Amino acid sequence: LVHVASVEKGRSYEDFQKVYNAIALKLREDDEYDNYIGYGPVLVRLAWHTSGTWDKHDNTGGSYGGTYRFKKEFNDPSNAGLQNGFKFLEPIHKEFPWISSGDLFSLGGVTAVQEMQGPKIPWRCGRVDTPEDTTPDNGRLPDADKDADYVRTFFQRLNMNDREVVALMGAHALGKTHLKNSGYEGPWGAANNVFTNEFYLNLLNEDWKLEKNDANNEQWDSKSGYMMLPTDYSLIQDPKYLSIVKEYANDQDKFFKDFSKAFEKLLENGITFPKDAPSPFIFKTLEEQGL
Ligand code: HEM
């Protein structure tokens, strides 16, 4: 399939900065969600789940079509808990009804990362809603009860290499697992609504114990109260992933640069940008605007 980006009619940078600002102001306002984590992490997870359905082999799924709005994908068991992110974005979409669903879900993730003090993520507009019959089937998102070989093979379908995989997984600095959503419980670290390289530091520095949670699933726990999924821990079991974990644990700037590239790529997979499409936009944070 070919999905050509088409700019929302007449819109330019200033329009999308206004959407960014509305998301960012609501992140500030709705700060109590999930015991004062706020909505930043769930919006990043939503951006990953809506883009992470992509299949490079046939260009199905991905961010372009905005198909999470349809029942089949909305009710994917892998998407449990993401309804909170969708409901957050509802009043944004009502204020800016011209933005496509795919542009909104992906911009939500960009805004959340930046407003949580993460790297700038260049972002391109022009995803176009596609009909219900284009919704990918359930089962395209990854399982957490797996090893490094599973992780590596899984991410090949998204055209991600080892460095891109390890960089993307650093988003697990954010938020937490919730037993009723995923069968896992606990946060990955302490500063879980600020985007940092703490995921890699915790992997390397904590004393992890393989325990069973209350859903009878194995997860790695530390005495500080942190947790890692089996797939997270696989990044220090595999020697190639381990080298990259060590790199990002020792170089915050390199992690930010590599995450920004990999996250933009994730959100753009499947999309053909015409020769005369606008350049990627770099949005100012509220702090940078004095707002
Ligand atoms: C092997 C790959 C991955 C697996 C197996 C995985 C699995 C999970 C699981 C089980 C949860 C807990 C959901 C819940 O209980 O609420 C979670 C949360 C989360 N995921 Fe991942 N994930 C992966 C990769 C990614 C990537 C690539 C990103 C973004 C770049 C991401 C972003 C997040 C965020 C931010 C949260 C926290 C959400 C919240 O606090 O509500 N994940 N993931």
Numbering used by the authors: 4 to 294
Can you quote the paper on this entry?
CcP employs a heme cofactor to reduce hydrogen peroxide in mitochondria using electrons from its biological redox partner ferrous cytochrome c (cytc). The reaction mechanism is comprised of three steps: (1) reaction of the resting ferric enzyme with hydrogen peroxide to generate compound I (CpdI), containing an oxidized ferryl (Fe(IV)=O) heme coupled to a neighboring Trp191 radical cation;16 (2) single electron reduction of CpdI by ferrous cytc to generate compound II (CpdII); and (3) single electron reduction of CpdII by a second equivalent of ferrous cytc. CpdII reduction is coupled with proton transfer to the ferryl oxygen, with the distal pocket His52 as the likely proton donor. Here, we use an expanded genetic code to examine the impact of hydrogen bonding interactions on ferryl heme structure and reactivity, by replacing the N–H group of the active site Trp51 of cytochrome c peroxidase by an S atom.
To resolve these uncertainties, we replaced Trp51 of Saccharomyces cerevisiae CcP with 3-benzothienyl-l-alanine (S-Trp), a close structural analogue of tryptophan that cannot serve as a hydrogen bond donor, using an engineered pyrrolysyl-tRNA synthetase/pyrrolysyl-tRNA pair (PylRS_S-Trp/tRNAPyl), which selectively incorporates S-Trp in response to the amber UAG stop codon. Stoichiometric replacement of the distal Trp51 residue with S-Trp was confirmed by MS analysis of the intact protein. The geometry and environment of the heme cofactor and key active site residues are well preserved in the modified enzyme, with only minor conformational adjustments to the distal pocket His52, thus confirming Trp51S-Trp to be a highly conservative substitution. Time-dependent spectral changes were fitted to a sequential a → b model to derive rates for CpdI formation and are similar for both CcP and CcP S-Trp (k = 96 ± 3 and 100 ± 2 s–1, respectively). The CcP S-Trp CpdI EPR line shape is very similar to that of CcP CpdI, confirming the formation of a coupled ferryl heme-Trp191 radical pair. Oxidation of CcP S-Trp also diminishes the 757 cm–1 feature of the ferric state but instead leads to a new feature at 791 cm–1, which we assign as the Fe–O stretch. Density Functional Theory (DFT) models (vide infra) of the CcP ferryl state predict that the Trp51S-Trp substitution leads to a ∼0.02 Å shortening of the ferryl bond, with an associated 44 cm–1 increase in calculated Fe–O stretching frequency, which correlates well with the 38 cm–1 increase observed experimentally. In contrast, time-resolved UV/vis spectra reveal that the ferryl heme of CcP S-Trp decays to the ferric state with rate of k3 = ∼ 0.04 s–1. The Trp51S-Trp substitution in CcP and CcP W191F causes dramatic 64-fold and 32-fold increases in the kcat of guaiacol oxidation, respectively, with only modest changes in KM. In contrast, the rate of cytc oxidation is only modestly affected by the Trp51S-Trp substitution (kcat = 819 ± 46 s–1 and 596 ± 33 s–1 for CcP and CcP S-Trp, respectively).
